[PDB]
């Protein structure tokens, strides 16, 4: 018996919540990830 | 010191009591006009002959969604996180701000929003024909009566729903003092509850901006000696409202709001309006070091003979 | 200063931020005072 309109209020704020997760982790790990596999190869260094 | 001071007023009551819903598209609609009215007699002589039924189905209506970019340019510490959090209490301030304000959708489709035929030709190719979307506000859809080309007319009574007559935007009439001062009367709030219990809305909530807050707490009081306060040895002076009942029987909570026109109040209700989104808050940059913001938002309100306005001013 | 000290021991996290928790939700994590105090209160 679940409601059309709790899935979209659950997708609403699952859909704000995955933006700030993504916001926040982006900054947080992947910026420092990618140099980090690029000096693995030793790509950074120009 | 490793800390900094920052006001932040962020009451924001509206945007947490009236939820949000997830859409697909830029233009969002519905259809709801009213019930068929009573026309009185409705004696018969054994026989129908009816003309195709008098239905006048539903009448569509629509809004449009705006974007709002509140950019970010660096050229403490981390200072990047620190402004990123501050435009965003900024862009839902000014959000709070737009939702309550009497603006008017404006775009080059009015009632023929498809136009799937044509949907401005002359757009590929150039490209640089890019129009401003202009979202509907809150005085707009409450069954206004004008507008003073994109803003409500604030000096214009609405006009009157053919289920029962009701008139959910009238102009205020203070009959207290001899038009000097701007403030409600002690019976305009309840003239709006008739209509309201008229037409049937039941609302429950008033957002008010502090500029007004005095009238409603002088209200407790009077000088013709029937309202008094009392203090039997008590060491309080509440001075304060936080509920009214007209004598409808139709309760009524008081918010303060002070992101609101001091020329206005509202009558809200929680379920009678949603917040339609399309586009979260991403945290990115443009195309191929800046950041910046971009939030799709619109407004959709059920029905405007739900929720009431009441300009407060001086007839002229 | 709680904050502060937090979120710099690291670069990463922020405790003052929404990490997606609506706040009516009643799984909203809230901050609570927890105190033990030696007195006569009596």
Partial sequence: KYSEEVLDELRVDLQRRFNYAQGYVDMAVKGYAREAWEYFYGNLPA | ?316 | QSTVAWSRTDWRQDIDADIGTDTEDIASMVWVYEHYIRTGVL
């Fill in chain 2, 1 to 316: 010191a490793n800390w900094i001071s920052v006001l932040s007023p962020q009451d924001t009551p509206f945007v947490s009591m009236t939820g949000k819903e997830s859409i697909n598209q830029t233009i969002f609609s519905w259809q709801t006009d009213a019930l068929a009215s009573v026309d009185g007699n409705n004696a018969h002589v054994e026989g129908s002959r009816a003309e195709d039924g008098e239905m006048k189905p539903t009448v569509i209506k629509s809004n449009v969604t705006q974007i709002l970019r509140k950019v970010v340019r660096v050229s403490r510490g981390r200072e990047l996180m620190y402004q990123l959090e501050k435009k965003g209490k900024e862009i839902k301030r000014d959000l709070e701000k737009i939702l309550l304000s009497g603006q008017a959708r404006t775009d080059v489709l009015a009632d023929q929003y498809l136009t799937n035929s044509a949907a401005d030709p002359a757009v590929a190719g150039l490209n640089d024909t890019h129009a401003a979307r202009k979202t509907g506000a809150f005085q707009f859809l409450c069954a206004h009566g004008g507008l003073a080309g994109g803003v409500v007319d604030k000096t214009k009574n609405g006009p009157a729903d053919p289920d029962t007559g009701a008139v959910t935007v009238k102009v205020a009439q203070n009959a207290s003092n001899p038009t000097t001062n701007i403030g409600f009367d002690e019976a305009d709030i309840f003239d709006m509850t008739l209509q309201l219990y008229t037409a049937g809305s039941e609302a429950d909530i008033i957002m008010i901006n502090p500029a007004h807050a005095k009238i409603f707490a002088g209200l407790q009081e009077n000088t013709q000696g029937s309202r008094k306060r009392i203090f039997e040895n008590t060491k309080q002076f509440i001075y304060e409202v936080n509920s009214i009942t007209d004598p409808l029987g139709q309760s009524y909570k008081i918010i303060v709001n002070r992101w609101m026109p001091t020329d206005a109040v509202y009558f809200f209700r929680s379920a009678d309006w949603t917040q339609m989104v399309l586009r979260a808050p991403k945290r990115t940059e443009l195309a191929k070091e800046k950041w910046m913001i971009e939030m799709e938002v619109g407004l959709r309100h059920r029905n405007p003979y739900a929720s009431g306005v009441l300009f407060t001013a001086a007839g002229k």
